[PDB]
């Protein structure tokens, strides 16, 4: 609604705004486009500014970035992308500001994008089942997590996308710990013990206690991981169908060269629907509905769409039961 057409790259007013909820369309844009949302969510948060990051820099590292995700179906650019900008979705419902500081931010930002680097599409325990480089390199302790967090260090170590070398040291060991911390929390082998632990903190939650606050940082970043159901069900779908790509190219591999095969990745058991009630009952909904009690705001924004997805998901089980009835 301008008075000329501006180039993809060059974010409508109107993209600008939508960028910062949960209903933003994911699918509609070019990488070179999200790129450009990103670097927008820099800037607009005010970590340009605080952490004298080089503008030129913060988008050559965006594209060092991009260039090491994988062209996998799932775990691939668009998801770190739909991460981090769930993520800044949040710092604007929870008012999140008000909260961490500016380099709490910067961490959570940071990574959200950066925590599937170079992802294989075949998960831990095939990494460990197969004896593969990467479960031998990290002796079977979050193989994938430990080397997405390597990554992010390789890149942030060439200097040309180095976002941080304007930090003193001890500013970049701080966010440095974090982001690890961060990025290994999002391995879902440790989801009931993340949760246990955050529970606890909750009895009596506060603010000003670092490790009250690590705990809830790792809860933020593993709520805008496993997102992608709190958005609209248009949006949200098709990642459904992406992440059963994996998981089925993955359990065929293992049968094929003799290894164990996880019932929830079985082509014969596993349906879209089946797959999503457990998942959006047993784990989305109990983790959001212990972060609305901090933030009350996430009940309306966050787990109403999560209750009538659970709620679509179980008109289709039937009909594909049904339909199941008459193929065989
Ligand atoms: N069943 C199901 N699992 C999901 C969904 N979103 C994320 N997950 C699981 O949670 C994990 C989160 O780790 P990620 O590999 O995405 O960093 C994924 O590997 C995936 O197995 C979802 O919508 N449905
Ligand atoms: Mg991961
Ligand atoms: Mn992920």
């Not at 929390?185 to 903190?201: C, G, L, N, V």
């Not at 459904?240 to 003799?258: A, H, N, P, T, W």
Request: aromatic share 10%.
């Amino acid at each position: 609604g301008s008075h000329m057409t501006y180039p993809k790259y060059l974010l409508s007013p109107e993209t600008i705004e939508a960028l910062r909820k949960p209903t933003f369309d994911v699918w509609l844009w070019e990488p070179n486009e999200m790129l450009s949302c990103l670097e927008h969510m820099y800037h607009d948060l005010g970590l340009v500014r605080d952490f004298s990051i080089n503008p030129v820099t913060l988008r050559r590292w965006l594209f060092c970035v991009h260039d090491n995700y994988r062209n996998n179906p799932f775990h691939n650019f668009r998801h770190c992308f739909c991460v981090a900008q769930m993520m800044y979705s949040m710092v604007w419902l929870c008012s999140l500001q008000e909260k961490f500081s500016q380099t709490d931010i910067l961490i959570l930002m940071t990574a959200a994008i950066c925590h599937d680097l170079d992802h294989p599409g075949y998960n831990n325990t095939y990494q460990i089942n197969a004896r593969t480089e990467l479960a031998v390199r990290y002796n079977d302790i979050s193989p994938l997590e430990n080397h997405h967090c390597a990554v992010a260090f390789q890149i942030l170590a060439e200097p040309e996308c180095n976002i941080f070398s304007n930090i003193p040291p001890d500013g970049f060991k701080q966010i440095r710990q974090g982001m690890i911390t961060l990025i290994l929390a999002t391995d879902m082998a440790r989801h009931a013990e993340i949760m246990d632990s955050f529970k606890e903190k909750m009895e009596n939650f506060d603010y000003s206690n670092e490790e009250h606050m690590t705990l809830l940082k790792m809860i933020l970043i593993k709520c805008c991981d496993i997102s992608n159901e709190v958005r609209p069900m248009e949006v949200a779908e098709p990642w459904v169908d992406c992440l059963l790509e994996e998981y089925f190219m993955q359990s065929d591999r293992e049968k094929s060269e003799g290894l164990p095969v996880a019932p929830f990745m079985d082509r014969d058991k596993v349906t879209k629907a089946t797959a999503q009630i457990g998942f959006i009952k047993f784990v989305l909904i109990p983790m959001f509905e212990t972060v609305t009690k901090l933030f009350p705001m996430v009940e309306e924004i966050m787990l109403q769409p999560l209750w009538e997805s659970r709620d679509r998901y179980e008109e289709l089980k039937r009909i594909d039961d049904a339909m199941k009835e008459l193929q065989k």
